[PDB]
Ligand binder design. Structure first.
Ligand SMILES: C[C@H](CCC(=O)O)[C@H]1CC[C@H]2[C@@H]3CC[C@@H]4C[C@H](O)CC[C@]4(C)[C@H]3CC[C@]12C
Ligand SMILES: C[C@H](CCC(=O)O)[C@H]1CC[C@H]2[C@@H]3CC[C@@H]4C[C@H](O)CC[C@]4(C)[C@H]3CC[C@]12C
Ligand SMILES: C[C@H](CCC(=O)O)[C@H]1CC[C@H]2[C@@H]3CC[C@@H]4C[C@H](O)CC[C@]4(C)[C@H]3CC[C@]12C
Ligand SMILES: C[C@H](CCC(=O)O)[C@H]1CC[C@H]2[C@@H]3CC[C@@H]4C[C@H](O)CC[C@]4(C)[C@H]3CC[C@]12C
Lengths: 10, 239, 239, 10
């Protein structure tokens, strides 16, 4: 998952 | 003496921190309003979540972090986010009123306020004592940002793959910090060791917070008040 | 004429609605504040999430809903929540200013405000037109709560197991509504048919909202602003 | 999943 984390990490 | 390499590392960290820590706390009015049993949970869940986004932003600017794999970046953040938030918060903490003063009265948090989000004094007592001891070190901004970077780049955090690369990055940061203190910090003979002990205090705070988070998040009536980012980062999922 | 059975059904629904719809909108100050591109998303995500909790509370008091299996209850809610929220909101909608007036100025929402959460006029135009047409029906409170209960207890919603039990519950509600109008509603000859058509308009609004929700929630920068309850209920997971 | 839904439905 970690959908938001991956996205914010660009 | 430092090299233009060690120097630019410090410059990079200070700039990263200035771009991710708003001294005016102007975004705090966007959070669910504070209300002084769990009355502060909606406001503090928003505050913590906003802080996590800022810590991710800070991390992406630490030299070498961006080159790590997405998996190690996530690994380092899930493990250290709560510690960096606790560390960065020392900037608003006041020894005078033992509170985190973030601008106006609506955003000045005392032990009383922060005990109204489900967490106990078992976590809050050591946290306030940590802030006090840390505030008394009178760290320069340079040492403050280096400490956060060192805390974040610990190769001994669960899920980390490229240990060698991360250990190399952290050792370089520690070298820069020892040199900065020796040269720029008058009477800082024992400061580095005091700063390293704070890292150990942070591991202990992380543990107590992790324990309480687990207990609380198990109740849906409580977890539903959190944000999707808090649930991701403080959750137990693994890459 | 109705039986004390049909009568107590109406009484149960009105009481359920009074216990779940605060005419003073006093909890709205607990939401992330409104800000008049996505400036209204934090506030409206909180407002919608709070409304979902209230719709669940209303549903648990509808006679017969509590006896359904946890799976059918979830099935009916995930499918109808957005429709019930749209229906219940007619109570704050004003034909005068074409806005949802929920107490003070801070919580009066016009087409301009509600277009600032990611959703387009493709959803908002039909929604405002739906409110207008519905407000013009001048429904008694009794017909209003019956319509919400009928909308919620539709056996043709995805994931529903005990169709017979649910169809029996809805047919009984429709019978009660037709009898109430005939007897208590002066000149309401064509009202029931107009109310049934509104249910069809709600299916169409549900579809457009579902479409837009899917598109928006695909962007983490947007979905992270939602609440865990909204993500559960509007999400696509199945029991 | 539906952790919150199940809980609220009592
Ligand atoms: C407001 C402070 C920031 C100051 C700043 O940025 O300048 C932050 C720093 C550390 C935070 C606490 C961390 C542990 C708990 C987490 C839980 O999700 C909510 C409760 C909990 C006790 C937080 C409260 C708010 C604190 C004190
Ligand atoms: C405990 C409080 C008292 C209720 C009472 O006494 O009846 C209620 C009033 C308004 C509610 C908040 C509404 C917005 C958000 C919805 C989201 O699904 C969960 C988080 C969210 C911030 C809720 C938290 C609980 C609140 C503060
Ligand atoms: C404030 C209103 C309630 C009045 C009341 O309770 O009295 C509610 C009723 C239906 C709601 C809209 C539903 C579709 C969209 C959902 C998305 O998560 C946010 C945007 C979206 C356009 C909402 C906006 C707020 C509305 C107009
Ligand atoms: C878009 C806005 C501008 C930022 C800028 O111009 O730099 C920022 C400022 C404060 C932010 C909110 C903070 C609380 C919540 C955190 C949670 O993880 C996500 C939801 C939450 C409500 C955020 C939404 C986005 C906001 C409103």
């Amino acid at each position: 998952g970690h959908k938001i984390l991956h996205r914010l990490l660009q | 003496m430092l090299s233009d390499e060690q120097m630019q590392i410090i410059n990079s960290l200070v700039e990263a921190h200035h771009k991710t820590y708003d001294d005016s706390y102007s975004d705090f009015v966007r959070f669910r309003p504070p209300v002084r049993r769990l009355s502060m949970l909606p406001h503090l869940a928003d505050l913590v979540s906003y802080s996590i986004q800022k810590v991710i932003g800070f991390a992406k600017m630490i030299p070498g972090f961006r080159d790590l794999t997405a998996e190690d970046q996530i690994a380092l953040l899930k493990s250290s986010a709560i510690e960096i938030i606790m560390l960065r918060s020392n900037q608003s903490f006041s020894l005078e009123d033992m509170s985190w003063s973030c601008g106006g009265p609506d955003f000045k948090y005392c032990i009383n306020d922060v005990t109204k989000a489900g967490h106990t004094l078992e976590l809050l007592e050591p946290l306030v004592k940590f802030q006090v001891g840390l505030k008394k070190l009178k760290l320069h901004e340079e040492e403050h940002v280096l400490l956060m970077a060192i805390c974040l780049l610990s190769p001994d955090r669960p899920g980390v793959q490229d240990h060698v690369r991360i250990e190399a990055l952290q050792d370089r940061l520690c070298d820069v910090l020892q040199a900065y203190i020796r040269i720029q910090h008058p009477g800082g003979r024992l400061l580095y060791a005091k700063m390293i002990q704070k890292l150990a205090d942070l591991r202990s705070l992380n543990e107590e917070h992790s324990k309480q988070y687990r207990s609380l998040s198990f109740q849906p009536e409580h977890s539903m008040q959190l944000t999707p980012l808090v649930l991701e980062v403080f959750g137990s999922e693994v890459s």
